[PDB]
Write a protein that binds this ligand. Structure first.
Ligand SMILES: NS(=O)(=O)c1ccc(Cc2c(-c3ccc(F)c(-c4ccc(Oc5[nH]nnc5C(=O)O)cc4)c3)nn(-c3nc(C(=O)O)cs3)c2CC2CC2)cc1F
Ligand SMILES: Cc1cc2nc3c(=O)[nH]c(=O)nc-3n(C[C@H](O)[C@H](O)[C@H](O)COP(=O)(O)O)c2cc1C
Length: 335
């Protein structure tokens, strides 16, 4: 009952725009270039129509599932978002605490405003994963992985779509990064560097930012454990498809050999249901978490995750799904 009265994820965004400095809100909101993919990440979900089954018995809903062999309370997890401390003083420590309370997983940015150890201490019982860039400096890359293994993180999400930073026009206009990303991130990396990381760690490895069937198959062939279908929140290459539109081609391409996840434009419970109906194991949210932080730190993130949880529960119930095992491709049809 905290004010203003926010009852959906778009209310959290509207609140954030009213309290964040322009250049911070713009950094978090922006897509790349004309933001074609940004609009489509959202619009594409509306074109997938639901076909609810009546009279299935939805008295008891169970949202529980597993990610990479680890139980979660719901198929709705926190994605890596850099610079959470610009949204709230507690930053990633607030986030992990909310994930611990919800029983869901947090993917930590490889350049978070909090250390791998600090986040493990704030959230010792939270399911925690590390998002990894392969830096030009492979010694710091290796150290992050070792620190993740040591601090009880359960997987590496290696981001492969950012050899350079996307062109976000508001960040250029605000004089808000591309030059710094280009100093640290290695744009030379290939499947050879994936072989290296696959040998470096026995943690589960997900390739984050695949949009092609052939690349997904290359990821399976290299012993990777998951695909995160991502266009990096439409902040990298503008004019790529919406993740919900390429998800089915990627699911088909991997023939059940690895878990397939989605991010990009998840705002509502029906977005989660549509993604699972098309074969995603779970979805990740980026921006909604930041809007949560901007509203009220830990409680704001908990609020956003609880809103998505309960929207998802209702969408499951109204569609005749008592649990995620019964969510099938006949629930959806593109229009
Ligand atoms: N609390 S803490 O001590 O752990 C802490 C961690 C991180 C930072 C910030 C940081 C930046 C750093 C700077 C300035 C920045 F502006 C950024 C940055 C912020 C947001 C970005 O946004 C995105 N990344 N991926 N996608 C996006 C997007 O916006 O879509 C990118 C870069 C990073 N680099 N950097 C690197 N150093 C090396 C190297 O060779 O030694 C390799 S990485 C680090 C340390 C990190 C360990 C590696 C400070 C600490 F205090
Ligand atoms: C503000 C912000 C910071 C981000 N930082 C990172 C990052 O550090 N590492 C990474 O792999 N992806 C990063 N991403 C991409 C997200 O992990 C994720 O793909 C995206 O937010 C999903 O789309 P959504 O914002 O529509 O939920 C970032 C995205 C945003 C919006």
């Amino acid at each position: 009952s905290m004010l203003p009265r926010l009852i959906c994820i778009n209310d959290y965004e509207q609140h954030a725009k009213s309290v964040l400095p322009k250049s911070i809100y713009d950094y978090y909101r922006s897509g790349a270039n004309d933001e074609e993919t940004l609009a489509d990440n959202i619009a594409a979900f509306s074109r997938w129509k639901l076909y609810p089954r009546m009279l299935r018995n939805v008295a008891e809903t169970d949202l529980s599932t597993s990610v990479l062999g680890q139980r979660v309370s719901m198929p709705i997890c926190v994605g890596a978002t850099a610079m959470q401390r610009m949204a709230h003083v507690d930053g990633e420590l607030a986030t992990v605490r909310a994930c611990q309370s919800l029983g869901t997983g947090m993917m930590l940015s490889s350049w978070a405003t909090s250390s791998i150890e600090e986040v493990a201490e704030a959230g010792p019982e939270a399911l925690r994963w590390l998002q990894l860039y392969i830096y030009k400096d492979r010694e710091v890359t290796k150290k992050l992985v070792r620190q993740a293994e040591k601090m009880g993180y359960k997987a590496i999400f290696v981001t492969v779509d950012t050899p350079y930073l996307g062109n976000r026009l508001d960040d250029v206009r605000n004089r808000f990064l591309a030059a710094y990303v280009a100093k640290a991130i290695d744009p030379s990396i290939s499947w050879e560097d994936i072989k290296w990381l696959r040998r470096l760690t026995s943690l589960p490895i997900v390739a984050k930012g695949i949009l092609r069937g052939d690349d997904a198959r290359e990821a399976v062939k290299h012993g990777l454990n998951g695909i995160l279908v991502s266009n990096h929140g439409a902040r990298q290459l503008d004019g790529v498809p919406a993740t919900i539109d390429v998800l089915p081609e990627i699911v088909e391409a991997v023939e059940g050999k690895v878990e397939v996840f989605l991010d990009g434009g998840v705002r509502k419970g029906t977005d989660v249901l549509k993604a699972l109906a098309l074969g995603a194991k779970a979805v990740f949210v980026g921006r909604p978490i930041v809007w949560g932080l901007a509203f009220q730190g830990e409680k704001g993130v908990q609020d956003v995750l609880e809103i998505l949880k309960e929207e998802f529960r209702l969408a499951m119930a109204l569609s005749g799904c008592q649990n995620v095992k019964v969510i099938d491709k006949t629930l959806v049809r593109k229009n």
